[PDB]
Amino acid sequence: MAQTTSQVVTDIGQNAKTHTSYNTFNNEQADNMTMSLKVTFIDDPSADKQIAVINTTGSFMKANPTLSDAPVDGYPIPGASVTLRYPSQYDIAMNLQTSRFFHVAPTNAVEETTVTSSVSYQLGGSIDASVTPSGPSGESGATGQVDWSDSVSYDQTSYKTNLIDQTNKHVKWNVFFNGYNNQNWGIYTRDSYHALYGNQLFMYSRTYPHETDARGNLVPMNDLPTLTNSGFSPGMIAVVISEKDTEQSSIQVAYTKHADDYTLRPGFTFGTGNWVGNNIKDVDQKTFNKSFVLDWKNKKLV
Amino acid sequence: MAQTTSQVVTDIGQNAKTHTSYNTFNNEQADNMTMSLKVTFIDDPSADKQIAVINTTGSFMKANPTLSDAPVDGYPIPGASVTLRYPSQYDIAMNLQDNTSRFFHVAPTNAVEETTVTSSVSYQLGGSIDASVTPSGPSGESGATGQVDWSDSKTNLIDQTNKHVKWNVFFNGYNNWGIYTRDSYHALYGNQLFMYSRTYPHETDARGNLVPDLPTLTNSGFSPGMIAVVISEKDTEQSSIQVAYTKHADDYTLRPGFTFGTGNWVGNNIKDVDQKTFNKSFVLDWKNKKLV
Amino acid sequence: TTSQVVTDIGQNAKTHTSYNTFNNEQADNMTMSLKVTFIDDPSADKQIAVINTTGSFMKANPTLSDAPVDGYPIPGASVTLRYPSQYDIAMNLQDNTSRFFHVAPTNASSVSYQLGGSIDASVTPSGPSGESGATGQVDWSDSVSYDQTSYKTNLIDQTNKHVKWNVFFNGYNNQNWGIYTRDSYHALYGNQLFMYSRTYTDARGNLVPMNDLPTLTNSGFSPGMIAVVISEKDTEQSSIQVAYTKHADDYTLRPGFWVGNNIKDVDQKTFNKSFVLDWKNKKLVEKKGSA
Amino acid sequence: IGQNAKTHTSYNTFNNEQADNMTMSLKVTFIDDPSADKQIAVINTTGSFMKANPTLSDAPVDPIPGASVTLRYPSQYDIAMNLQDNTSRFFHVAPTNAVEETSSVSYQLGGSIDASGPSGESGATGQVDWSYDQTSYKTNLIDQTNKHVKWNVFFNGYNNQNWGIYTRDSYHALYGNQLFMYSRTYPHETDARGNLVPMNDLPTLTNSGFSPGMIAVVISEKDTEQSSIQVAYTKHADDYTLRPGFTFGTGNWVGNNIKDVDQKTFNKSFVLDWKNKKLVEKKG
Amino acid sequence: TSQVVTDIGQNAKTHTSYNTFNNEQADNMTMSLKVTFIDDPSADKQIAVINTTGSFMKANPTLSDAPVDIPGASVTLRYPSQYDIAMNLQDNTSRFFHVAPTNAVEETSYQLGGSIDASVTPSGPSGESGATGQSYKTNLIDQTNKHVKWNVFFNGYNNQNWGIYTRDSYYGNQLFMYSRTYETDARGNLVPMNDLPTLTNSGFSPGMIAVVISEKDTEQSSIQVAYTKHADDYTLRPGFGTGNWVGNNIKDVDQKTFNKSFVLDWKNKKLV
Amino acid sequence: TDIGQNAKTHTSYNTFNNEQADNMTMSLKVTFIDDPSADKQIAVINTTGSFMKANPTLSDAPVDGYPIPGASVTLRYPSQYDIAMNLQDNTSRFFHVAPTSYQLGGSIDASVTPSGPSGESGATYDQTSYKTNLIDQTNKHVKWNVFFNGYNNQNWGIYTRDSYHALYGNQLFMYSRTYPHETDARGNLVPMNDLPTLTNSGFSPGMIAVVISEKDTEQSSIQVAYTKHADDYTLRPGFTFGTGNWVGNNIKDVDQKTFNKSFVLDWKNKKLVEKKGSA
Amino acid sequence: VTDIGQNAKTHTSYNTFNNEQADNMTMSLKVTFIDDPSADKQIAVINTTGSFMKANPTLSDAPVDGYPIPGASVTLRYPSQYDIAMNLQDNTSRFFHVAPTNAVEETTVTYQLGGSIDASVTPSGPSGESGATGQVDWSDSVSYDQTSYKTNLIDQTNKHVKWNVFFNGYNNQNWGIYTRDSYHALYGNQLFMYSRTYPHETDARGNLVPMNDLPTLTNSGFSPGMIAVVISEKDTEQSSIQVAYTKHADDYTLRPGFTFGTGNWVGNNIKDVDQKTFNKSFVLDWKNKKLV
């Protein structure tokens, strides 16, 4: 179609569809994850090989606990120890054990900016008068300003969906986390340090905290993004092509969840009147992999 | 399409077993809710299994009463408790019995949220001259400044499975003054989320000091459009899904918890006060491809 | 992962029926309209029928009290105008459960800091001055939209029996919204939602004109609300009701105690009618038979 | 409707009223669905109607040939379809009326030292800050029935050379309405025919004319045989006038308008002739 | 309902697209036409849609050039203003109706203060407490059944990034002046043509569409198709005391016409 | 109202050639449609391909050396581009062508000494790359000038072929002034890719025209001209006034590279003229 | 109908992919042959897909993190240019339509009076002020493709077609805009800086702005979707295209160079240091319309 040619023609799908859509779904309840996949085989005899479109769907939960509960520790210990396992990285892999992973979705696109360069200049003039013991003034101003502005459609932290290293064998994605505006103040990230508060991305009372248990001094789950409390739903699409000479293959479909443990403690300097929040990188990881046979003669999948 | 493929090929619906649309509707009047469902069976011979799409519509009423008319009977602590049951969460769950089949693709989900952080910087210069009387007397001025300006500008999915899928319809904020949330704290007012009149209007009962001017949903109701999909083997015959409908509610009251000078009425609201549940099961016949 | 027009019912179906019935209620100058279409999918369990309500209902906004206009208190401004506020339209299935069902429509930080520097001079003095400023701002703003004129097709409670809609009124910018946010207040003006002149003369011509206000408020809204009823092949008849209502308020002005006042629903009139949904021959409250 | 019904009997009938240079147009297509109960017919009104904006002053009457100059600027354009109160029932009319679709607070702090009266400071400040058809041709659906349907495309106000905003109702402080004024005090004693903003210096429609696209539909039983619909077209006019001598002071020009001065209507009926649907007056 | 159907297109017979193009080189104008005759049996009459395309040049000269002459230099430029297009059917034949495109409508705080000041021994502290409270419009003159007209006026343009000047903006007019300060030939003190709007230096490309219907009994018709160009003569003078450059223009100076007739045969739906 | 109903044919032809002197690539896409319902036969011509800018600084190559006359850097940056289509003054007809606030105040102050108050009461563009114009067409010669207007160099702007300054001249392609690296200005120009996508790479024409001739008529030798035009901005610390003020000025049409090839339209003989005979 | 390819029998889409693991590049290509009998020649559309990784190392990361002698000598090899070329052998030729293309970059370029009175007591009266000002603001803005992905089409031919997806600039920690030539008097280039001043002791390998704190492309890989088409006469028999894939790289480095300062980290960068290329030829058979 890029050469004033008919659309949906250069595109495979003319007198050859057979549309052999298959589905297989599975759950790993230990980390309460739900895999989904959607394959459709297209075998056009005009081509040399048989094409198969793979669509992964479903969702994968954050499953956000607070696993270290030391409420205040008034007298013996220098203070509380409350942690929260906030997930950060969500790597998804499809490792072919055959034939190449031809297409990969989504990809990288443009980022939208609006940089502004403003200049303004002014003039002034005034008069003041008096009669009885009092002095008059005068004024005649002149001003000139230059303003520069920036603005980008950054998707808060949400979870940015980058396309990490591909292969015709191993496809990967690393949908990371960036930062959030806790209680309308922001934007704070995983790096932002304060001399007397630490990281406040997960702080609840943003002015001065009453001396309460840190198990209930966290900003609530739903006071944070929709994904961070619920889970992301993949829509990643991949395609596999194999020759009519070639036959059955054995795919792997891995889904992972990196997790971070943002912690609140007075034990990490001060924290008595205020309350300090801290973050230690890459704490929890869990993996669940699964293999699948791609039949190519009857164009099923088990 | 995104795979340089022809449009509408990867998706099923070709020489497939019709669009067996079924329908079932009922009303639970106690909380006056009206459930609706519309299933469509697709039996693709090219596929290995049989597809069925479940679409949930209809409507759920809020039925928001004012159950505490204290200011009207005995004025306890001048101008007392008027309560309002503002519902907050609306969980809808579909829990298939843990022996039969698997749940599959579900709509809606959570989505990326986009923000726009701005960084503006401006710098200027100044200059002026003054005149006076009493023979001879000018002044002068020469300014220089620089500014930096920064500007900026919920349907949650609680744990799902191939067996139990659930959603959490949260609440975000309200305004003509600034945003206030389900937790917004005032040192001398508490939560003022639905406050109308500050400092008392006429020492009136709080039955008529509430802001009426608020969203369409509360009172009227939102209509769900949630979609789910189930696929089952061609050999197997039946299944027993559950469909739970819930309404968690909060009870914001306007009472003299605190009162100062001109009756500065105080408002407080506490989460998840009232709950109501309404479940019903449905038979997933797979050989005759219906559902009651 | 589904195709287009595949989850939708509409395959190898049977005669789409598409009947019509229109009538006028002239007392309140009302025009009722209905759009029924029966669709009988053999693949389904039951028979589907889509009802589309159309036509219109006029506001016909008068000023019905123009006489106190001479002298002595309560005089040349005791002018009332019956401005309607709420427009509920109801479809109450005969309490017997013909299974109502699906329905349409439905319901749904800045910071700036600066720095300064200056010098002050004179003519024959002894010393100059200097200045070094520092500023920092924090700005928070909001803005709402959607249905400002508030003709919002809210969906008040539906059932398997009675479906309803409430297109109410919130507020508008009369003249130039110099005041009145919406059924609001003023300590010396009252409600200014319907004020033309703040100082001004007969009060019949000191009102902001009918056409100086939104298109609907002077003319009337046309419903397009559609509902669908599905019933078993066992059933052969149905009995919906179709109510049309017009709640109205009587906004009145005053010279002084220029005071204006909004008054909650005072006078209303309704026009409802039921319809027979014959399912074995697809007739309505009209026409006859055949064979 | 209109599914596997065929017919699609598009007819056309046009006439011109040259006195006010109006051009009526109609576009009917009859659809007879056997699945339906009755016979459907959609009528589409098109064509145009001119504004014909004159300045008909200083006309055979002439010390003041440059005084009291009027312009008959139209305001309302009502289009009506009045079936006689004994026929087949009017139904759906297009278009309809639709819904038409900020608060900021900022607080700051200050503090300064003036060195190198003024030798100290400490500030605190707080601020609170709060799709118009400017070419006002609002297309309202004014009172109708299943017998007489009407429309009121009225006019509201304009942005005179981006300077305003003035309406036909709101009046300049001590000038009346200046919406069609070009120069307020520069031409001190000039002829009043030429102190207006040109016809083209204001919206596109105001000097030329609107083309209707109003569509209506009539349905009648298959038992019934004939109908006698009427379709009226009207043209209201306003009288904005310019004169000098207001309160003197550099020739303040008086701008005034006494509303609803001239009116014109152009109606004609048509026989639908269901028998053959000829929809062109006449008879059977 | 049947409201958005109005289906003439359906089973439209003969699809008789015709084409004819011509040029009038004197004013470098190019007329184009696209006719299609449709004889729909469902209709009463036979319909024919005419689509006008092509282009028309501005051809902007400066034909009065006295280079350096209180009395100015008198260099004028004939910048055209109005572009009238007329279609004059003889006042006895069938009807004309419908016109595309059409005209459209146009879519268009309280604060507080506070401060405190400190100073030295006999000076005194201060305070503060503030409070505050705050063009190528395409017009469609009336259609008729025979004689249709178009005018499509223009008002003004914004000279290089500054201000706005119209066909009535009174330096005098600087609409076509480049530098006002102060003295070459006045033929070359104008802002360059490509530094001015795209239309002013090129031309307009008509896209006007019209439709004609005629009764099945009657035969042939004799339409006119006029193309016109009203022109204005903007004039430049370099002082007409400081030496500033003054610009003047008077409306409706030059007009030129190029008309052509066409036979509407109706029994075979050919247009020559 | 559009030709394409029971019209068959669909005889898409193509002819491509390269002009290596300016490294230009002309492309053509003709499709003949002979609708029997019409009177004449329709043929749609679509010109595609691209033409490189090839923007040099003709004062280049390693310098160091022993130069007396300062630096003297020039750049031949093209401005206008044209795609004329001139059918021979005796052929068929060309029928259609594409593209075508107030406030108030009040305040109070308090002080020391007898009677010490004080009061206050206040009361108050498709720039940056080119333009796609259509100079007047005819039924014989259709021709357009895709010229260039202005750019915002290094976040400062906007500057244009007319942009003036009292002490720098035109700075449209300036990187930095006053003392810029005070080296050769060959590496003091704003980089070519710091400028529009077109200016450093080349524009791809997409102009569409259509030719129709009567079923009676024969032959229509057309001609497809392709041209370019460059501006010559000069910048040097050898014609200026020393004291920094490194000024630079720009002039008009200086370089041109026209390319032509009268493809015999063959309004019935298809095979557009190509390598004439065997190659 | 203006578009060719309708009922165009041959749609013989083939695919051929390979990976070069040393610099971890993976080439992919997608051709479909269409043989239109109405035309004179046979058309073949090639779609380049797959991806190419940045694989961004810090290869000079301070060996043992030595403070005064090694000091601040951590570099980062950030690639800049990504040229993709298709060079037909000089006997076949006949390149035609190429996607994507270039386009116009879009830009958007864009008085008061006073009066007041002051009053006091003591031998004194009122004061006055009457201001008058006027300002003229001038702004501009485009939709910057700032991060990277400026997708230019350098000169095409019937022999060699090329693309230069360059890199332009970035907003380092939301401040900008900074480019490869952005100089500061005391810091050099800050395009790749994390911390504007560290108190003397951090490793400079972990003093970089994090990888994901930089554009999506910069840390992962660009995925081409670039399409080209080759047409050849029915007389001709075969052709030999080249498909080169390249990655020019820059070495952004913090190096003593000019000794050191008061703990402030200087950043510098020199262009186009290391590059890697991966080319391969392919036979475009035209009789059986395959391609190895």
TrEMBL record, chain D:
Q: Which Pfam families match?
A: Leukocidin (PF07968)
Q: Does the keyword Cell membrane apply?
A: no
Name the UniProt key words of this record, in alphabetical order.
Signal
Q: Name one GO biological process term.
A: cytolysis in another organism
Annotated Leukocidin/Hemolysin toxin domain ranges read 25-276
Cellular component GO terms, alphabetically? extracellular region
Record-stated family: Belongs to the aerolysin family.
Specify the protein name. Cytotoxin K
Give the originating organism: Bacillus cereus
Q: What is the lineage of its organism?
A: Bacteria, Bacillati, Bacillota, Bacilli, Bacillales
